């Protein structure tokens, strides 16, 4: 049979696939879209494919224009797999550690390419890594009180609020509430 991998992530079919846009940013978190091989392991209210990604940004009367992927334990999807055209850059976030100032560098100038170049549109950065939750969390909450001033903990509530699910890696939250600007 073929080669490549297709589990599930574990737990990723307890999560809402795609949060709200949060008002105030450019930002939307989802958890990661997986490739047609995996589908042979869901029910079909279970898949999630990059169609569904797409198809679900539209239900909000949204647009995406950039995809910002955290992932690295499988090849989840191909970029150049996506049924629409979007720019997209990987970041890899490795582990339970807090993500290193090098991965939160790469994230914020990501954003601000995208942004200083999209001044005439409300397109989205949209952000995932396995459950669209932790490291994602972690990242757009990091960019916005390093970067716009924003108190941790309404960062955090808007995620969370957002997203429809809650932020759970402690360390990520001990980091956010205390830790350095970087
Ligand atoms: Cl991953």
Excluded at 8 to 14: A, G, L, T, V, Y
Excluded at 78 to 86: G, I, N, R, S, Y
Excluded at 91 to 104: A, L, M, N, S, Y
Excluded at 165 to 174: A, G, P, S, T, V
Aim: negative net charge.
């Amino acid at each position: 049979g073929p080669l490549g991998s297709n589990h599930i992530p574990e737990r990723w079919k307890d999560y809402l696939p795609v949060g709200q846009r949060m008002p105030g940013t450019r930002f939307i978190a989802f958890k990661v879209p997986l490739q047609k091989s995996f589908e042979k392991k869901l029910a079909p209210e279970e898949c999630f494919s990059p169609l569904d990604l797409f198809n679900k940004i539209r239900e909000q009367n949204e647009e995406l224009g950039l995809i910002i992927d955290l992932t690295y334990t499988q090849r989840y999807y191909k970029p150049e797999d996506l049924p629409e055209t979007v720019p997209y850059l990987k970041i890899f976030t490795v582990g339970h550690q807090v993500p290193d100032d090098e991965t939160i560098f790469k994230f914020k100038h990501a954003v601000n390419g995208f942004l200083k170049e999209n001044k005439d549109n409300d397109k989205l950065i949209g952000v995932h890594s396995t459950h669209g939750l932790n490291r994602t969390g972690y990242l757009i909450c990091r960019y916005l009180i390093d970067v716009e001033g924003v108190r941790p903990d309404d960062a955090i509530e808007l995620f969370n609020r957002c997203r429809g699910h809650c932020l759970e890696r402690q360390n990520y939250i001990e980091d956010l509430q205390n830790g350095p600007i970087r």
